[PDB]
């Protein structure tokens, strides 16, 4: 009940929107015979809509004055009202995946530079090496913070290409 908003199950506009969607799906369904493929397609669409509306309810989602669910982004407030699974857990998961991408790209950049014509390896990818680095990135934060600890993650300002002042 934060931000002056009501839960989706307790709200009336949420149920009104669900009823309107079911009504227009039934209006589209009534134009087809029950023994036709569009009838089964529309029945599956209605079942998916009902399942989605049931899953959005009883999951902590809340909507304000329009029946459209709202998401709470501040940690702590989302922790004490069971809204962490809205954005807090997905943002951590996306950070994990983005760090996976960055670590894999960094490993491929570093590991394909101690050879003749590194641009050729950049343009024609070493597929077994790329797959090996792909399956070795599951521990990206450990290796990242260890490279930070030993100083190989960052380059010194003496070996870095720099623009004139």
């Amino acid at each position: 009940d934060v931000a002056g908003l009501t839960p989706c199950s307790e709200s009336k506009a949420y149920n009104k929107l669900e009823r309107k969607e079911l009504k227009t799906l039934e209006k589209r369904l009534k134009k087809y015979e029950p023994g036709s493929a569009p009838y089964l397609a529309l029945q599956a669409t209605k079942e998916r809509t009902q399942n989605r509306f049931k899953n959005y309810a009883k999951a902590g989602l809340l909507c304000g004055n329009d029946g459209l669910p709202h998401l709470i982004s501040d940690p702590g407030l989302a922790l004490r009202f069971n809204h962490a699974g809205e954005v807090f857990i997905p943002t951590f998961g996306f950070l994990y995946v983005a760090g996976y991408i960055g670590h894999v790209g960094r490993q491929y950049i570093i590991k394909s530079k101690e050879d003749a014509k590194p641009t050729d390896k950049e343009i024609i990818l070493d597929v077994p090496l790329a797959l090996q680095l792909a399956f070795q990135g599951w521990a990206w934060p450990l290796a990242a913070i260890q490279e930070l600890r030993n100083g190989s993650l960052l380059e010194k300002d003496e070996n870095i290409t720099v623009s004139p002042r």
Binding site: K117, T119, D120, I123, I124
Partner: protein, 97 residues
């Protein structure tokens, strides 16, 4: 005077030139060093007048490219006919257009 003039097997069907992206021009044959090379790979692909100065090779490339475009067009037409055959209501449309 007018007769068929054809050379037999001037180019061997090998994948050795598929590995090298920049091969049609000597400027791109040295390999890439900047990203503007890559666009130059996709810009001078059909610039057959710049790859070679021989008109015969350019004409052969033009003939092959026209055959490829006709094949692409026929693929698109066959796909259109297939979509009309299966994922369509043409039979229903014929009853009441």
């Amino acid at each position: 005077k007018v007769k068929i003039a054809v050379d037999r097997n001037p180019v061997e069907t090998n994948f050795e030139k598929w590995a090298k992206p920049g091969h049609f021009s000597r400027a791109l044959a040295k390999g890439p060093n900047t990203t503007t090379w890559i666009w130059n790979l996709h810009a001078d692909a059909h610039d057959f007048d710049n790859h070679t100065s021989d008109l015969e090779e350019i004409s052969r490339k033009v003939f092959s490219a026209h055959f490829g475009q006709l094949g692409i067009i026929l693929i698109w037409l066959s796909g259109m006919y297939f979509h009309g055959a299966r994922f369509s209501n043409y039979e229903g449309w014929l009853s009441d257009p």
